[PDB]
Amino acid sequence: SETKCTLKSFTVEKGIYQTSNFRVQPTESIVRFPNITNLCPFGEVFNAT
Amino acid sequence: YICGDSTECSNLLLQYGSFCTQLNRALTGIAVEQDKNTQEVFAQVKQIYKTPPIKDFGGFNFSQILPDPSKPSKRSFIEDLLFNKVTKFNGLTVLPPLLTDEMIAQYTSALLAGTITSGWTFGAGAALQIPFAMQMAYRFNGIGVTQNVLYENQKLIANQFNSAIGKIQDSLSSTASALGKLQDVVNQNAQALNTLVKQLSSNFGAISSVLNDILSRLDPPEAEVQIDRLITGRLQSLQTYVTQQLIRAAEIRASANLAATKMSECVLG
Amino acid sequence: LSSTASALGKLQDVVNQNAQALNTLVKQLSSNFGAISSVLNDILSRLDPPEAEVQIDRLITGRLQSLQTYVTQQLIRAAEIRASANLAATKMSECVLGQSKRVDFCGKGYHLMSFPQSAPHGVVFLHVTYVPAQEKNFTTAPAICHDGKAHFPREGVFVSNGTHWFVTQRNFYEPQIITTDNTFVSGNCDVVIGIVN
Amino acid sequence: FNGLTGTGVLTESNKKFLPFQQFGRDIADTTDAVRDPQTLEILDITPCSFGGVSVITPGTNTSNQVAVLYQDVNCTEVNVFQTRAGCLIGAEHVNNSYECDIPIGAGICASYQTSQSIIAYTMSLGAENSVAYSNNSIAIPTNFTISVTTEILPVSMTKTSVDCTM
Ligand SMILES: *[C@@H]1O[C@H](CO)[C@@H](O[C@@H]2O[C@H](CO)[C@@H](O)[C@H](O)[C@H]2NC(C)=O)[C@H](O)[C@H]1NC(C)=O
Ligand SMILES: *[C@@H]1O[C@H](CO)[C@@H](O[C@@H]2O[C@H](CO)[C@@H](O)[C@H](O)[C@H]2NC(C)=O)[C@H](O)[C@H]1NC(C)=O
Numbered sequence: 001s002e003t004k005c006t007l008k009s010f011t012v013e014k015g016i017y018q019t020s021n022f023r024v025q026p027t028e029s030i031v032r033f034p035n036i037t038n039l040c041p042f043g044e045v046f047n048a049t
Numbered sequence: 050y051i052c053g054d055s056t057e058c059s060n061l062l063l064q065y066g067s068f069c070t071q072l073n074r075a076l077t078g079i080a081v082e083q084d085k086n087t088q089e090v091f092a093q094v095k096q097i098y099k100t101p102p103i104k105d106f107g108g109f110n111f112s113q114i115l116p117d118p119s120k121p122s123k124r125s126f127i128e129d130l131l132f133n134k135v136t137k138f139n140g141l142t143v144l145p146p147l148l149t150d151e152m153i154a155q156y157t158s159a160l161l162a163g164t165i166t167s168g169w170t171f172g173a174g175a176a177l178q179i180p181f182a183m184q185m186a187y188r189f190n191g192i193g194v195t196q197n198v199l200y201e202n203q204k205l206i207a208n209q210f211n212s213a214i215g216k217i218q219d220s221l222s223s224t225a226s227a228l229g230k231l232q233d234v235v236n237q238n239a240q241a242l243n244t245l246v247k248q249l250s251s252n253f254g255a256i257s258s259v260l261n262d263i264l265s266r267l268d269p270p271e272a273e274v275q276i277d278r279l280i281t282g283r284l285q286s287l288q289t290y291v292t293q294q295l296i297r298a299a300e301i302r303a304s305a306n307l308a309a310t311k312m313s314e315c316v317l318g
Numbered sequence: 319l320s321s322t323a324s325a326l327g328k329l330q331d332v333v334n335q336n337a338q339a340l341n342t343l344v345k346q347l348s349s350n351f352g353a354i355s356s357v358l359n360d361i362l363s364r365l366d367p368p369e370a371e372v373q374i375d376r377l378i379t380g381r382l383q384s385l386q387t388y389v390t391q392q393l394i395r396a397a398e399i400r401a402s403a404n405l406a407a408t409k410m411s412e413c414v415l416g417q418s419k420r421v422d423f424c425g426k427g428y429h430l431m432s433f434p435q436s437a438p439h440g441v442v443f444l445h446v447t448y449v450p451a452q453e454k455n456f457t458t459a460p461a462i463c464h465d466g467k468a469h470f471p472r473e474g475v476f477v478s479n480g481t482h483w484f485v486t487q488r489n490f491y492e493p494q495i496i497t498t499d500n501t502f503v504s505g506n507c508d509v510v511i512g513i514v515n
Numbered sequence: 516f517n518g519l520t521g522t523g524v525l526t527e528s529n530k531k532f533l534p535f536q537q538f539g540r541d542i543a544d545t546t547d548a549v550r551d552p553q554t555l556e557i558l559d560i561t562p563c564s565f566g567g568v569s570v571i572t573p574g575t576n577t578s579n580q581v582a583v584l585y586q587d588v589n590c591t592e593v594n595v596f597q598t599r600a601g602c603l604i605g606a607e608h609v610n611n612s613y614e615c616d617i618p619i620g621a622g623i624c625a626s627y628q629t630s631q632s633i634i635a636y637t638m639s640l641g642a643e644n645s646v647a648y649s650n651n652s653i654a655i656p657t658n659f660t661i662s663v664t665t666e667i668l669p670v671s672m673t674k675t676s677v678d679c680t681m
């Protein structure tokens with residue numbers, strides 16, 4: 001039926017007809033951001049002598 | 050090509066509609082024509098003829114052009130020299146040639162076997178075995194020279210032919226530019242495709258060449274106009290490309306009809 | 319011809335291609351090309367002329383680009399048709415108006431005649447070709463050493479079923495007796511390779 | 516990767532990204548080799564399989580059986596037979612090479628044949644008729660045929676003409 005729709009009018013005859021485009025869809029989406037800025041000494045702002 | 054799986058582009062392209070179905074039809078025609086060209090050239094023989102192991106062709110060494118069984122691809126030494134001489138993810142795909150290189154090799158093998166054992170009658174009707182010396186004598190009669198010249202100088206002519214085959218080997222092995230035309234063809238195709246790839250980097254008046262960047266920056270109401278500019282640019286590039294390749298395929302078809310005319314006239318007669 | 323319609327497939331394809339192009343042009347009138355509609359009347363009735371002008375400019379650019387694409391397609395197709403027509407004229411001149419000795423240019427086999435027949439936007443040649451049907455093996459020889467003088471066949475083949483020797487034609491079997499007028503003399507019977515007696 | 520959106524098989528990269536090289540790029544402004552923001556590590560990309568879907572069919576009147584050829588896709592991903600053009604679903608692969616009807620590609624062709632089904636095989640380039648050559652044997656035709664063939668040639672096309680304004 002896909003092929004019949006590709007020809008857009010008639011009933012298919014002998015041969016091969018390019019119909020559609022399969023694509024291996026992405027399994028998921030990987031999101032990876034940084035802590036933005038390297039490091040700050042909170043451990044000393046809190047645990048100060 | 051116009052967009053890497055962006056739905057906004059998909060819809061703004063539905064606004065244009067058949068503008069790419071056209072192109073696909075054209076390219077499919079081109080591919081079918083390529084197939085037809087190959088069949089026109091090589092598929093002129095009906096039955097695959099096979100050379101007998103008895104190489105009693107009166108000194109005419111044909112080892113260098115008859116297929117060597119040892120090679121994985123059954124190809125003549127000359128064809129090996131030729132093969133050594135000649136050397137994306139955006140919808141751009143290269144469909145495989147229907148006839149493999151090995152089937153074309155077997156076709157040329159059958160043609161050589163026919164023109165060697167039967168000479169030319171294998172092209173008119175069924176192959177008719179005939180001693181190669183007599184076949185060359187008939188060719189000489191066709192030139193205007195009489196049979197006596199050949200039959201009296203068979204050894205000398207055989208030596209000249211073998212030395213000429215050796216010279217052809219040397220010229221093919223040394224000078225790569227001997228096959229320049231074919232290389233040019235390949236190069237042209239590659240060039241076109243590469244240029245298409247590079248067209249994905251042009252702005253065409255929009256802010257960027259990445260529809261994702263446009264959609265992330267601009268609101269959809271204005272991102273639509275920018276994507277329309279980008280789609281117009283990329284579609285125009287595709288049209289230019291398919292036109293270039295239509296013209297080039299027309300030229301290739303002209304050369305292929307010339308090659309088929311040769312294959313029919315000189316080879317088969 | 320009566321049963322298999324696909325015998326004329328090429329011509330049909332030509333017509334189809336043309337029709338296809340025209341139909342696609344028609345359908346291009348339905349695309350928006352970035353404007354609000356495909357009916358300039360609708361654009362003018364909706365939008366004011368100052369902005370209707372920009373929308374009509376988008377639509378005009380789209381339709382003009384479609385026309386350019388179409389005329390280019392048909393220029394290329396007409397070039398191909400002209401190539402095929404020059405081929406057909408070359409045929410009509412060579413095979414029809416003569417006898418083309420170009421092997422397999424006028425049908426598989428030795429070409430005898432041809433008969434052109436019109437057809438919608440094309441021609442159909444009835445290439446009448448000779449095809450040798452039945453084959454027989456024979457023992458042959460390049461020449462014949464009669465009296466130390468090598469005898470070569472004037473026109474034909476030295477054939478031998480297995481008892482006598484005859485001269486024949488290279489495309490039919492009329493084995494004739496080897497007189498001194500079916501053959502010409504040239505040299506001795508040693509330089510020849512494969513000469514018989 | 517820090518706002519960088521992109522799809523594809525994420526393998527690892529041996530590509531030496533000098534410390535200032537986080538993500539790579541291609542000829543179509545597409546990243547090819549990327550890196551980690553959190554625990555810096557390099558990676559390679561190969562966009563995973565897209566491909567064409569082409570339907571092989573005898574005439575609908577003859578049968579309604581279909582052979583779906585996935586081109587540019589190994590059906591490791593998605594009566595299954597792997598070709599070099601792609602892979603078929605719905606066609607048994609026979610080894611007996613016949614003259615082929617539906618050119619699949621890469622030398623392989625399909626046809627409707629018996630239990631009628633769609634079968635795929637390699638092209639038989641023709642009956643391997645070995646001509647019995649000999650240094651002193653010839654073949655003379657004794658009888659002939661007068662065969663008439665048809666040669667169809669397109670001569671003209673529809674002499675169209677368009678008006679631009681209309
Ligand atoms: C005809 O060609 C064959 C194949 O190239 C020649 O045989 C080769 O001869 C060389 C030199 O002796 C050897 O190194 C190769 O191994 C041979 N190849 C084979 C397959 O036997 C043969 O000498 C040539 N004959 C003439 C007179 O040119
Ligand atoms: C005609 O030319 C051929 C060469 O094309 C001559 O054959 C050569 O003869 C010389 C001298 O004997 C040899 O050294 C060469 O090796 C031969 N070449 C070949 C290809 O066999 C031939 O002798 C000439 N004939 C006349 C009468 O001049």
Ligand SMILES: *[C@@H]1O[C@H](CO)[C@@H](O[C@@H]2O[C@H](CO)[C@@H](O)[C@H](O)[C@H]2NC(C)=O)[C@H](O)[C@H]1NC(C)=O
Pocket residue numbers: 479480481482
């Ligand atoms: C080759 O052909 C010749 C000629 O047709 C054959 O000789 C004939 O044999 C028949 C039967 O004995 C005689 O009636 C004829 O008078 C012979 N004709 C001649 C020219 O002498 C010969 O027998 C054939 N040989 C073979 C093996 O077929």
Ligand SMILES: *[C@@H]1O[C@H](CO)[C@@H](O[C@@H]2O[C@H](CO)[C@@H](O)[C@H](O)[C@H]2NC(C)=O)[C@H](O)[C@H]1NC(C)=O
Pocket residue numbers: 513514515
């Ligand atoms: C044609 O006749 C010649 C001469 O009788 C044959 O050549 C002779 O062959 C024999 C056997 O090999 C030799 O002993 C003679 O010395 C050869 N004579 C000469 C002058 O060369 C030749 O073989 C005969 N050919 C055929 C087909 O019968």
